[PDB]
Design a binder for this molecule. Structure first.
Ligand SMILES: Nc1nc2c(ncn2[C@@H]2O[C@H](COP(=O)(O)OP(=O)(O)CP(=O)(O)O)[C@@H](O)[C@H]2O)c(=O)[nH]1
Ligand SMILES: [K+]
Length: 308
């Protein structure tokens, strides 16, 4: 028969659960959410269907107070509850802000558990703003290294990059939604790739080949119309204003192109060439195509890049 992949998104700590709440608000389908936190006040406000309060014996229901050893121990002591919530997942996205205690310490434990439960495990984490100081940055760096050791693939968003995309008045919440989009569009892109039957079909086994045990990653989506649409969508898919890891140096790529019946062979080559040339490597590509006749002049390019 057919395979139906279960995708889960797990928020760990404040920032991660913020991202989960905003994704649920934005509306996601076919994805399951898990909220993990020490902070009982924030966890009570989570919109996630599955909630795990960790470390209550250690924190009395408070956060970890920037102590990553308490975050790590809190997750370890709730291993069975975390395993039970994950069980059945084919793919898990662990999202977390690094630099505090709960996210820094517990997110690598959650990711380790997910991988041991058999899930393809992707971390999407932030580094703190420079204005938060050097100690926060150093602690975050230890969290990023622990994440790298625990996940299949890791996407790092330095929060300082948000300062590159705001004007002096952009609300902080609007900026945070831009960082959220990295996770949301990557999850949505995989979900859609799985759900739809393509003319050149890609599926979850291709995602596993490109992402399993591959270190840093990029996940992007680009949409364009009109003249040069394939080139423009491909460039947008690989544009990484918020990413620590750019496309440069990628050695494996999952690339899908969705368009209407006008989708031309020539423009599919144009788009593939953009990704090959930007990588500035010989990229091992798994290429797919979907014809969606509901589309008119719109083209959508999805890119997952690993192998740096
Ligand atoms: N882009 C973004 N960054 C966030 C968000 N919330 C927190 N951050 C950033 O993540 C870092 C850690 O914050 P948070 O996730 O609340 O930490 P925690 O580990 O839960 C806090 P404690 O140590 O007390 O338990 C912050 O220093 C900040 O850089 C958010 O919603 N969006
Ligand atoms: K498919």
């Amino acid at each position: 028969g057919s395979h139906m992949a279960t995708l889960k998104v797990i928020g760990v700590g404040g920032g991660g659960n913020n991202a989960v709440n905003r994704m649920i608000d934005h509306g996601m389908n076919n994805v399951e959410f898990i909220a993990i936190n020490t902070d009982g006040q924030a966890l009570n406000l989570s919109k996630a269907e599955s909630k795990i309060q960790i470390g209550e014996k250690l924190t009395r229901g408070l956060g970890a107070g920037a102590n990553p050893e308490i975050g790590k121990k809190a997750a370890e002591e709730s291993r069975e509850q975390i395993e039970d919530a994950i069980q059945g997942a084919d793919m898990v996205f662990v999202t977390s802000g690094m630099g505090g205690g709960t996210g820094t310490g517990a997110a690598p434990v959650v990711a380790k558990i997910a991988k041991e439960m058999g899930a393809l495990t992707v971390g999407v984490v932030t580094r703190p703003f420079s204005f938060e100081g050097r100690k926060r940055q150093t602690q975050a760096a230890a969290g990023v290294e622990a994440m790298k050791a625990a996940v299949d693939t890791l996407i790092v968003i330095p929060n300082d990059r948000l300062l590159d995309i705001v004007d002096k008045s952009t609300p902080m919440m609007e900026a945070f939604k831009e960082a959220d989009n990295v996770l949301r569009q990557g999850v949505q892109g995989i979900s859609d790739l799985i759900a739809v039957s393509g003319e050149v079909n890609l599926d979850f086994a291709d995602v596993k080949t490109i992402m399993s045990n591959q270190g840093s990653a990029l996940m992007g989506i680009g949409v364009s119309s009109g003249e040069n649409r394939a080139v423009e969508a491909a460039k947008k898919a690989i544009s990484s204003p918020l990413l620590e890891t750019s496309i440069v140096g990628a050695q494996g790529v999952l690339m899908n192109i969705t368009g209407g019946e006008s989708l031309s062979l020539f423009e599919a080559q144009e788009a593939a060439d953009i990704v090959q040339d930007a990588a500035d490597e010989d990229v091992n590509m798994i290429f797919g195509t979907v014809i969606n006749p509901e589309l008119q002049d719109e083209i959508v390019v999805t890119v997952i890049a690993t192998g740096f």
